Amino acid sequence: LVHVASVEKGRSYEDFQKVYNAIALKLREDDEYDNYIGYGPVLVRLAWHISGTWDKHDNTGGSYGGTYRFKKEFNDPSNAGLQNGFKFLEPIHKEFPWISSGDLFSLGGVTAVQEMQGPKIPWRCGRVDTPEDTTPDNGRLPDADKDAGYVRTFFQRLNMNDREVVALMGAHALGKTHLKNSGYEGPWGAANNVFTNEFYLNLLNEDWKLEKNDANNEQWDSKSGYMMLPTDYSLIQDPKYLSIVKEYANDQDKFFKDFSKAFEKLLEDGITFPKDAPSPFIFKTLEEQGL
Ligand code: CCH
């Protein structure tokens, strides 16, 4: 399996910037979502979910194919709640029908992060919609009631090392868990719609109590009213993870750089970019454009 990136016929950066801007404008507009959190977080999760199905062993899954659009993947239990992100993007697609699905899903994640004050994430176009037949089976996404060993092992399937894993996990500063969706309830911090290193700070500074939730699952609860998943928690239980956690808790800049690189990589896994492919684009935020 080889997935070669093929630029949408006759489209350029400017063409992408527009899709970006549309998404960005809509985020700005549809702010009531999830008790005023906004769709930022959900879009970041969508991009990660369409990308986390990848399997470095046989190259199946990953963002390339836009397979999320198919029932199999769409109805994946680990995907519960992602439909709100889809529905959000649907009109955008209608407006820009020439964009491939994988390109759209992934671009919304990039837009989200940058509009939420995150770092700039270089992005590449070229994903090609694939047939229903290429939809990976359910079960490729990670479970939350596990530990560091599970996490290390899991992430390896996507080629991510310790550092990448910790960086990537800081995405948990955003949004929250929802009982009805995953069997977990509560946010991980206070500024849930702004990109910061809050995650690490929380993990290291709160007084966490393990408790069972209404779904009968364990989670670490803080007095402040925050929560952490077992998998999140495991980042402080593991010696190697822990020092990275500390480094990020100490330097947001470092965090941002590392996050940026890992996120791109995560979104570009399983894809082959020809020599003549354009460089990755760095989009301007609304604010940078005075819009
Ligand atoms: C870089 C992206 C990223 C990584 C990587 C990543 C990795 C992990 N995630 Fe996550 N995720 C976000 C981004 C990332 N997460 C974001 C953002 C959300 C918030 C969504 C929302 O607020 O609707 C978000 C929500 C949840 C939910 C809540 C679902 C609900 O709505 O009820 C669960 C459970 C959960 C489980 C795990 C586990 C397990 C892992 C890996 O081990 N994540």
Helices (H), the chain: 13-29, 33-36, 40-51, 71-74, 83-95, 101-115, 148-156, 162-169, 179-182, 198-205, 230-237, 239-250, 252-268, 286-289
Q: Are 141 and 75 in contact (CB under 8 A)?
A: no
- What does the block give as tokens for 104? 């759209």
User: Is 57 in the active site?
Assistant: no
Q: How far apart are CA 28 and CA 32, in angstroms?
A: 10
Mutate to test the pocket of ligand 1, among 33, 172, 203 (most ligand atoms within 8 A of CB): 172
Determination approach: X-ray
Q: Are 31 and 88 in contact (CB under 8 A)?
A: no
CA distances from 199 to 94, 204, 237 (A): 36, 9, 15
Ligand 1 near 44 CB (within 6 A): yes
Q: Residue 290 burial by CB count (10 A; 0-12/13-18/19+): exposed, middle or buried?
A: exposed
Q: Residue 182 burial by CB count (10 A; 0-12/13-18/19+): exposed, middle or buried?
A: middle
Q: What domains, with CATH codes, occur in the chain?
A: 1-141+263-291 (1.10.520.10), 142-262 (1.10.420.10)
Q: Per the residue annotation, which of 123, 188, 208, 220 is the catalytic one? A: 188
Nearest to 202 by CA among 176, 232, 182: 232
Q: What is the resolution of this structure in A?
A: 2.2
Element containing residue 222 per DSSP (H, E): strand 218-222
Bridge-based pairing of strands 176-177 and 218-222 is: unpaired
DSSP string over 19-73: HHHHHHHHHHH-TTHHHHT-SHHHHHHHHHHHHTT-BTTTTB-SSTT-GGGSHHH
Q: How far apart are CA 160 and CA 153, in angstroms?
A: 10
